[PDB]
Amino acid sequence: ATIKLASKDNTLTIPNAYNLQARASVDWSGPIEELTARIAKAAHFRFRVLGKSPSVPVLISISTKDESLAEILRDIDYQAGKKASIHVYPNSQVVELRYAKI
């Protein structure tokens, strides 16, 4: 993915973190894992996927001229719905993509 740096509740799963406050412009759609990994790298966070990537990839779309990486991640998380979830660990600085694959 590529970013231009300038109902499920995810309050505890995706809390705020300093590096995720950074603002960015994003115009992209495609594999959730691709953009999520790009955001994590951009925010200096480790990225890891838990579970197994679904047969049919979870696609998401982000169109914003200015948004925080944190809000973009929450947008992406919602879009994934029951198909997957994003966890953000502020102390260890890890972004986790968990495929709810069962």
**Boundaries of every domain in the chain:** 1-102
What is the C-alpha separation between 24 and 65, in angstroms, rounded? 7
User: How many angstroms is the resolution?
Assistant: 2.0
Please, which residues bridge with residue 67 across strands? 24
Q: How was this structure determined?
A: X-ray
Distance, CA of 102 to chain centre: 21
Fold of the domain spanning 1-102: Phage tail protein beta-alpha-beta fold (3.55.50)
Both tokens of 38, joined, read: 């790009």
- DSSP code at position 22: -
Location of structure tokens 């799963």: 13
